[PDB]
Each structure stands twice: as C-alpha cells, then as structure tokens.
Amino acid sequence: PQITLWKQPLVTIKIGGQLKEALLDTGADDTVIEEMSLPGRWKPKMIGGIGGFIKVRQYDQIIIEIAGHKAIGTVLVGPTPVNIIGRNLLTQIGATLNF
Amino acid sequence: PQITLWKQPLVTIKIGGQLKEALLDTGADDTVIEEMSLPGRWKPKMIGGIGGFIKVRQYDQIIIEIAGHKAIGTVLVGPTPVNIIGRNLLTQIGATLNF
Ligand SMILES: CCCC[C@H](NC(=O)[C@H](C)NC(=O)[C@H](CCC(=O)O)NC(=O)[C@H](Cc1ccccc1)NC[C@H](CC(C)C)NC(=O)[C@@H](NC(=O)[C@@H](N)CCCNC(N)=[NH2+])C(C)C)C(N)=O
C-alpha cells in the first residue's frame, strides 16, 4: 500500500510461523530480527550501523510474509533494538519510495 | 526525493550552504549529518542505532534542500558513518513507501 511517514512504518510479519512487528527500513541493506528460534542451520556474521557492530546469526532462504506479501530470503537474527525489513527483502515485495 | 529503496537510496541535499549526498532512511526517526561547522546554538544529544549510542549536537529550525525540495527541521551533527535523512524531514517532502 502507500505508507506515509508521520508515524514509523511498522507492519506485521510472520516468520517461523509466529507473528512479529517490524519496521520497513530503507536505510538497511539487510533484514534483522530480535533473537528467536528459527528452523534451519545458520552462519555467524557481523553487521553495523550507528553505535557500531553487533553479532548475529544469518539464516538463508527464509520464507517471510510482510503485510501479507511473501518474500523468501536472508534474515539475520541478533540483538537489534527494533526488527527491520531491509532492502534485500523490500526489493522482493516491490517497495519504492518514489519522487 | 522520496527514498527509492533498491540499491542504496542516496540523493543530493543542501545544508549550511554545502552540496551533500545522503541516504533516505525510513526507520531513522532523526536526521544526522556528518560533522560540520554550522553556526547556530545547539544542544548536546545522544542518538541510538544498531550497535549503540552516538553523541551529536542538535540544531533546530535548520533549512535543508532534499533533491531540490525545501525542508526545515532538527538536524543532528556528529561522527555518523553516512549522512541520513530521517522521517522528520521525509514527511515534509511528502515521501511515501509504495508496494
Ligand atoms: C549485505 C552486507 C551485510 C554485511 C554488513 N552490512 C551492514 O552492516 C550494513 C551496511 N548496515 C546497514 O545497512 C544498517 C542496518 C544493518 C544491516 O542492514 O545489516 N543500517 C542502519 O543501521 C541505518 C543507518 C546506516 C545505514 C548505512 C550505514 C550505516 C548506518 N539505520 C537503521 C536504524 C533502524 C532502527 C530500527 C534501529 N535507524 C537508526 O539507527 C536511527 N536511529 C533512530 O532513529 C533512533 N531514534 C531509533 C531508536 C534507537 N534507540 C533505542 N532503541 N533506545 C539513526 C540513523 C538516527 C557489514 N558488516 O558490512
């Protein structure tokens, strides 16, 4: 849909069968969720932003539904202060901000 | 001017008289520019992100130009790894997420 920004762009997502709330983040390359149990083998990685770098577990080929829109890709799980859907997944669902 | 999210949504902005490039970040409640000498009375602030907090100076009622669009607002200046336009300014240019 068309989402304005007077409020944070939070939507609901379903991963690993459970619901969770996440922020549509245009400033992130990747998708990162707070620590949870996800089926599948994972690989340790480091990612950074403001503040610095944090360790996370990278899960490849995760099926995720973001506002009823399916994507299947890389999700990173670790201690992010907020769950964010980055461009890696936003691209999959056809998100554009525009002009 | 809206955050064309796919490849890093970077655009030209004008602040304090200098031409700059910034990342349009839904998910950035704030705008934070690279260290620079802006005249104007400030307030010391601490903003948090991915891996922690960063000390920045807060300037209010700052006039900036985002992809040829005029906006006025609170700009924070500090040791940021990239210039970030946050929702506080994105809303004034009418930027929206579309999928
Ligand atoms: C595919 C490559 C992956 C490998 C990895 N890549 C990265 O780490 C890439 C560059 N990082 C990013 O893209 C990260 C997000 C993590 C990620 O995407 O993986 N982006 C980010 O962290 C971007 C800013 C940024 C962009 C580019 C470079 C640096 C920084 N900010 C995202 C973030 C979202 C929010 C939900 C936490 N927003 C902010 O950090 C803004 N903060 C705010 O708006 C605060 N008011 C939010 C509350 C914080 N406080 C609290 N909870 N008590 C700030 C910019 C004013 C690497 N190691 O190089």
From Swiss-Prot, chains A, B:
Active site: residue positions: 25
Region called Dimerization of protease, residue ranges: 1-5, 49-55, 88-99
Domain Peptidase A2: 20-89
Top-rank taxon: Viruses
Described purpose of this protein according to its UniProt entry: Aspartyl protease that mediates proteolytic cleavages of Gag and Gag-Pol polyproteins during or shortly after the release of the virion from the plasma membrane. Cleavages take place as an ordered, step-wise cascade to yield mature proteins. This process is called maturation. Displays maximal activity during the budding process just prior to particle release from the cell. Also cleaves Nef and Vif, probably concomitantly with viral structural proteins on maturation of virus particles. Hydrolyzes host EIF4GI and PABP1 in order to shut off the capped cellular mRNA translation.
Subunit annotation: Homodimer, whose active site consists of two apposed aspartic acid residues.
Name listed for the protein in its UniProt record: Protease
Organism: Human immunodeficiency virus type 1 group M subtype B (isolate BH10) (HIV-1)
Organism classification: Viruses, Riboviria, Pararnavirae, Artverviricota, Revtraviricetes
Full-length numbering of the shown residues: 501 to 599 of 1447
